[PDB]
Amino acid sequence: KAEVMKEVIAKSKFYKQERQKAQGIMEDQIDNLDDNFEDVMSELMMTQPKKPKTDLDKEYDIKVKELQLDKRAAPSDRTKTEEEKNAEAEEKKRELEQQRLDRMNGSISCPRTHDALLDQVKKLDLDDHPKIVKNIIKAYQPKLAEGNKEKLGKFTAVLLRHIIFLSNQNYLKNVQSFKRTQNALISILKSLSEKYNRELSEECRDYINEMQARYKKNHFDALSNGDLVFFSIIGIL
Amino acid sequence: ALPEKVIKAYTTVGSILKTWTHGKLPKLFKVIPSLRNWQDVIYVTNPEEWSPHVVYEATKLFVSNLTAKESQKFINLILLERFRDNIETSEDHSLNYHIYRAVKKSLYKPSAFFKGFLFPLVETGCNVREATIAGSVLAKVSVPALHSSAALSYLLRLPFSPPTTVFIKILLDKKYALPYQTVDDCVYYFMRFRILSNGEDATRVLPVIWHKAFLTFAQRYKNDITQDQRDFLLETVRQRGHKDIGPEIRRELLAGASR
RNA sequence: AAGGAUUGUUGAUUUUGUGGGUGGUGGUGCAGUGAUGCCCGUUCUGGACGCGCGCUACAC
């Protein structure tokens, strides 16, 4: 066995040396060739020769231009069967519930500030707030332009303060429309939170710190109706 | 007749490329793309004798520097021939790893690749093994939708052959935004196998590779066809449907909304 | 972005951002073919000899 291996090792080394020797010869040929490049090039240029597409080639180029003119179809995915969708939905529910158990055990302007949103919506009626906020999201989707994710992320914090701000304002006059807005804005906030929960989380804590600081001077007068709303929104999100 | 000094210099290059595996290519070889009469210069370098490593590098150097028209001659005259030769002569009928990459670099220029590799191959007795290896290269590498659609459009009109079906399905498998013209051509292609006056395509036996291709079209472009077109395709399944794949296609076709 | 994104000089093949699927030049057993049962790469570099007498430490 050992003798066979030594022959094997010797053969591998022997072939390795041959490859290296060839490589040693290999580079020398390239070096000599490169030195004579100018002489070879000069003769070739002196002997340079003096100055119809296939029917298949003509058709293909014509097709590309015609295809450019025509409109483009959106591609779709295969429709999953109801049993597969139910199985996938059950698996996701089974996964999500399990992690929860473990955690239990341990044109349109995007307002970067809350005041900016009021200026945009200042002339709009109360029931028009869901329309404007939704449009801002559509006008600044992540795909439309770079940085829209950050603008939408900031807007999530802005929108949250607006929900709390409206609750502070008196609304006994038009409770029905006010009811038609807060839930509508909250639903948008739920969609926004799914993508910008980091941004929402940062704003929420600061409000808690702001909540504490105002409680450190005023006692119950600092507390307001929207303050109760704020604790409720955290529970949803 | 190149200069005798040039012939000896490039004859050395021909020897260089036979055993070349790594390092820097010869300077004379790297300047061949600039030369007008590359055909004569490339021939003396013995393209058939190029090592697989050289073929990969040669496609990189030449596809990049060159015009679209000239690059077609390369992909057709050298890369395509080498691609067929390696598969035919290999014991397992497999393609070498370096040659496999060379096709991808040729795909860097889509128009040259299709008219130099794909269309000549399918129109010159392509075999199923050749289609599978080439199709996988097409599958993994990225292609423009416009160029892919033209290639898909070209394949349909050709007479039905097993190699042609493999290339069509992969293009369908890419999930491209096919132009509305291309979708209609795909619909026409599948209609022509339905029995009606009609050609032999109505009665020609259809392999699953046709059924798999037709399923892919239904899965992805069911929402991009007219209601009448959907009806013709549904009739095609009723006449030429497969035992197991056919019910699935009917489910997908019926689930799509009319454009 | 053609008045130029990207390429080793080239031209929309790529670059940035946002979404996004797949083990797939797989192998193997069955009846070229099969919605097919079963599982699941490339090139270099290195491979204090024994016996034995005596003595000396190890024990609140």
Residues in contact with A137: Cβ distance below 8 Å, sequence separation at least 6, in sequence order: A152, A155, A188, A192
- Quick count: other Cβ atoms within 10 Å of Cβ B253? 22
Chain A residues in contact with B224 (beta carbon < 8 A): 73-74, 76
DSSP string, A8-56: HHHHHHHHHHHHHHHHHHHHHHHHHHHHTHHHHHHHHHHTPPP----HH
* Residue A112 φ then ψ, to 5°: -75, -10
Measured distance CA(B131)–CA(A123) in Å, rounded: 66
How far from the centroid of its chain's Cα atoms is residue A220's Cα?
A: 43
Measured distance CA(A128)–CA(A103) in Å, rounded: 40
Cβ-defined contact of B19 to A63 (cutoff 8 Å) = no
Cross-strand pairs, A72:
B179
Structure tokens at A175: 């409770």
Q: State which approach was used to obtain the coordinates.
A: cryo-EM
Residues in contact with B3: Cβ distance below 8 Å, sequence separation at least 6, in sequence order: A43, A44, A46, A47
Measured distance CA(A232)–CA(A228) in Å, rounded: 6
* Residue A105 φ then ψ, to 5°: -80, -5
- Quick check: A195 and A148 in contact, CB under 8 A? no
How far from the centroid of its chain's Cα atoms is residue A75's Cα?
A: 20
Cross-strand pairs, B179:
A72
Measured distance CA(A6)–CA(A235) in Å, rounded: 74
* Gapped junctions in chain A, after residues (C–N > 2.5 Å): 51, 106
How far is the first Cα of chain B from the last one, in angstroms, to the nearest whole number? 62
Please state whether A219 falls in left (phi above 0), alpha (psi between -120 and 50) or beta. Answer: left
Instruction: Please report how the helices B208-221 and B180-191 are oriented relative to each other, as an axis angle in degrees rounded to 10.
Output: 140
CA dist A159 → A128, A177, B95, B102, B128 (Å) = 14, 18, 59, 54, 60
Among A37, A41, A44, the residue to mutate for chain B (most B Cβ within 10 A): A44
Burial label, B5 (beta-carbon count in 10 A; 0-12, 13-18, 19+): middle
Interatomic CA–C1' length for residue B76 and nucleotide C23, angstroms: 33
- Quick check: B71 and B61 in contact, CB under 8 A? no
Structure tokens at A129: 């707030």
Find the chain A residues whose C-beta atoms sit closer than 8 A to any C-beta of B: 22-23, 26-27, 29-30, 33-34, 36-37, 39-41, 43-44, 46-49, 53, 56-57, 59-61, 63-64, 66-68, 70-79
Measured distance CA(B104)–CA(B98) in Å, rounded: 10
Measured distance CA(B142)–CA(B161) in Å, rounded: 25
DSSP string, A151-196: HHHHHHHHHHHHHHHHHHS--STTHHHHHHHHHHHHHHHHHHHHHH
Domain that holds residue B66: 48-186
Q: Residues 4-43 of A near strand C (Cβ < 7 Å)? A: 9, 12, 16, 19-20
Interatomic CA–C1' length for residue B9 and nucleotide C18, angstroms: 54
Residues in contact with B21: Cβ distance below 8 Å, sequence separation at least 6, in sequence order: B51, B53
Structure tokens at A83: 């049993």
Instruction: Please report how the helices A148-168 and A175-218 are oriented relative to each other, as an axis angle in degrees rounded to 10.
Output: 90
With tokens 């020769």, the residue in question is A49
Chain A residues in contact with B10 (beta carbon < 8 A): 40
- Quick check: B178 and A75 in contact, CB under 8 A? yes
Interatomic CA–C1' length for residue B200 and nucleotide C19, angstroms: 45
Kindly tell me the sign of the dihedral angle through the C-alpha atoms of B39, B44, B45, B46. Answer: positive
How far from the centroid of its chain's Cα atoms is residue B35's Cα?
A: 28
3-state secondary structure of A228: helix
- Quick check: B171 and B140 in contact, CB under 8 A? no
Shortest alpha-carbon distance between residue B77 and chain A (Å): 15
Nucleotide nearest to B92 (CA to C1'): C25
Instruction: Characterize B196-226 residue by residue with b for buried, 16 or more Cβ atoms within 10 angstroms of its Cβ, and e for exposed.
Output: eeeeebeeeeeeebbbbbbbbbbbbbbebbe
What's chain B's Rg over C-alpha atoms? 22
Structure tokens at B213: 């291709």
Shortest alpha-carbon distance between residue A20 and chain B (Å): 12
Q: Residues 90-129 of B near strand C (Cβ < 7 Å)? A: 94-97, 100, 108-110, 128
Q: What is the resolution of this structure in A?
A: 3.2
Instruction: Please report how the helices B227-240 and B245-254 are oriented relative to each other, as an axis angle in degrees rounded to 10.
Output: 170
* Residue B179 φ then ψ, to 5°: -60, 150
Cross-strand pairs, B104:
none
3-state secondary structure of B158: coil
Cβ-defined contact of B179 to A41 (cutoff 8 Å) = no
Nucleotide nearest to B146 (CA to C1'): C12
Q: Which of B81, B139, B85 is nearest to B107 (CA)?
A: B139
Q: Residues 200-219 of B near strand C (Cβ < 7 Å)? A: 207-209, 211-212
User: Largest Cα–Cα distance of chain B, in whole Å?
Assistant: 71
- Quick count: other Cβ atoms within 10 Å of Cβ A84? 10
Nucleotide nearest to B245 (CA to C1'): C35
Q: Residues 135-194 of A near strand C (Cβ < 7 Å)? A: 142-143, 146, 148-149
